[PDB]
Design a binder for this molecule. Structure first.
Ligand code: HEM
Ligand code: HEM
Ligand code: HEM
Ligand code: HEM
Lengths: 141, 146, 141, 146
């Protein structure tokens, strides 16, 4: 579970990464389709070619719910009410596909924002994204 | 089990730029903290009850250098990861009993730690190439069942 | 998450398996050490030989917290307050070692109480034991 | 990769007593219900929006019989699970993209389903012997990476 310092290190970081989203949330999905092609099965409607307006733009959407999900660090289930259904009942996204995205999100922050993500911050950030998906799988687990 | 051309050149054009010492404790200090049910195998390592200490123990310090020194044995010999970590496949099984998941977990710590040490020069393709290298050094050990 | 019918099928079953605990909770640990020797590393203080007073008796303890954990199906974190620390901070039990036990628990009920554990009941039971451990790992995740 | 004497005799002294039909839908109907992000690969299977239907579809019915009919190919040929499910190692990878965990998950459904069909005659050792057989038929498929 997140305690204050979890919830607060996960704030600290999101107070810096406020700058960029279609620049940072967007780089973790290009990292997802490249390292894990397989997850391209969820997007036949999409173009996945290096650079497109879909991974830029749906990219910019994924940061938001993680940014939003950070603003409501105590009640995230409700703060991601629609999303958890659209992912768990409708699209039916295999559980593991979250850890990879979650982990994909860590890389991009390790890319651009090194000297924030210290080991402890790493932990918090992990527990967070790692419970962001939990609340997205809610419907099946 | 197959290694496409640009992959080899890439896991090394970024390997030899690794400071085996500094990114050594880093992968290990991170793995003890963010996955602390793992500290259970390192009780013979001294005081590990704080990040400050998990970052700072001498025993952890120079076990790291060793652990990452084990990935240079993957890089140079990219066709025979079987043979290299076959003795470590045992010691990470029959001796200690370390669940496969844990490896795969250190694996990610490691793919995170250079993505911080190399910034923009560690690209999605490059990541595609290492997180893959993880999954194989990761698997070489995962064998004493199969 | 558990909804009523989850919480109620998980009652139904525990209203039958009330009969046996040092007879049923005890058979899932003999199943654990035999299928997964490795988990014998947590018990050097124990005898694990087919039949002993330890796996009978610590066995009888594990059912209880699962029976207790069933009686408080809404607030299980508190209902297993001690346990989650003694397992997550002290003994430091590897996360996966729960699913195996959890799964070990399912077998024994599939052994003795077939025509309860229907597919849906299976699901509920799964979600339950699968969240019993979650609340036991709480401290690390 | 090694098969101790009493194991072989045990996975069969209990195999030939399996009703490949009835425990066929059972392993599959259970896997669609208790792991429903898996129904995603069976959209071409018809109406699967209820246990009653997941238990009761004809397509699911006679895919089960097939799936468990695939475990009899493990039992008879206990030294060569490599060769048997090598073509299914592909189809459960390059064609569909089914994450290793899922296999290991059907594996348990299966070890549960006979533990219900055979009662006391399915003993801890016997379970030690099958949950093992799972982990290998499970692995034979897990190869098109490795
Ligand atoms: C960090 C965890 C995740 C977050 C925060 C997240 C966020 C979002 C958001 C904000 C949407 C847009 C909803 C809309 O406007 O309709 C969405 C939809 C979607 N997500 Fe995720 N998601 C996550 C995990 C995943 C994973 C693991 C996958 C699978 C690999 C996935 C695949 C999809 C797909 C296919 C859509 C629908 C796209 C479309 O039809 O336009 N998501 N997600
Ligand atoms: C997956 C990547 C890993 C690699 C490449 C690796 C490599 C190594 C190396 C080089 C040694 C030194 C043995 C010697 O010189 O005698 C070692 C031993 C050891 N490893 Fe790992 N290892 C890995 C993962 C893990 C994991 C996941 C754990 C536990 C969760 C672990 C725990 C240990 C322990 C406790 C030792 C013995 C050190 C001692 O004596 O205290 N290793 N391994
Ligand atoms: C269904 C999940 C579990 C339940 C309900 C459970 C329940 C319990 C209970 C009631 C105790 C007794 C506390 C006491 O009297 O001190 C205990 C202790 C213990 N448990 Fe578990 N446990 C679970 C999972 C696990 C797992 C997965 C493992 C590792 C394989 C494990 C290993 C231990 C050990 C080593 C002790 C201490 C025994 C002793 O020192 O006497 N438990 N657990
Ligand atoms: C791990 C044990 C498994 C075994 C032994 C097994 C075996 C089989 C067999 C015998 C077929 C028939 C192919 C043919 O006759 O052409 C098949 C195909 C298939 N399998 Fe599996 N399978 C396993 C696991 C899984 C899992 C875990 C999934 C998904 C989560 C899955 C999904 C499928 C699908 C969708 C097909 C194609 C059937 C169709 O055309 O609709 N299988 N497999």
């Amino acid at each position: 579970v997140l305690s204050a310092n979890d919830k607060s290190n996960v704030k600290a970081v999101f107070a810096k990464i406020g700058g960029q989203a279609g620049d940072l949330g967007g780089e973790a999905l290009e990292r997802l389709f490249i390292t894990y092609p397989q997850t391209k099965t969820y997007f036949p409607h999409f173009d996945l070619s290096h650079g497109s307006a879909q991974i830029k733009g749906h990219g910019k959407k994924v940061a938001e719910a993680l940014v939003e999900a950070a603003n409501h660090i105590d009640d995230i289930a409700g703060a991601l009410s629609k999303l958890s259904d659209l992912h768990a009942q409708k699209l039916r996204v295999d559980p593991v596909n979250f850890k990879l995205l979650g982990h994909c999100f860590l890389v991009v922050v390790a890319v651009h924002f090194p000297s924030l993500l210290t080991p402890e911050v790493h932990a918090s950030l992990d527990k967070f994204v790692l419970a962001v998906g939990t609340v997205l799988t809610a419907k099946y687990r | 089990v197959h290694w496409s051309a640009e992959e080899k050149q890439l896991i090394t054009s970024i390997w030899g730029k690794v400071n085996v010492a500094d990114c050594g404790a880093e992968a290990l200090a991170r793995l003890l903290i963010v996955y602390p049910w793992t500290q259970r195998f390192f009780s013979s390592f001294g005081n590990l009850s704080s990040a400050t200490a998990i970052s700072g123990n001498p025993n952890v310090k120079a076990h790291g250098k060793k652990v990452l020194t084990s990935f240079g044995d993957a890089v140079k010999n990219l066709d025979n990861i079987k043979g290299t970590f076959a003795q470590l496949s045992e010691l990470h099984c029959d001796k200690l009993h370390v669940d496969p998941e844990n490896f795969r977990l250190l694996g990610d710590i490691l793919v995170i730690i250079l993505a911080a040490h190399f910034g923009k020069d560690f690209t999605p393709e490059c990541q595609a190439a290492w997180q893959k290298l993880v999954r194989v050094v990761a698997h070489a050990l995962a064998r004493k069942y199969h």
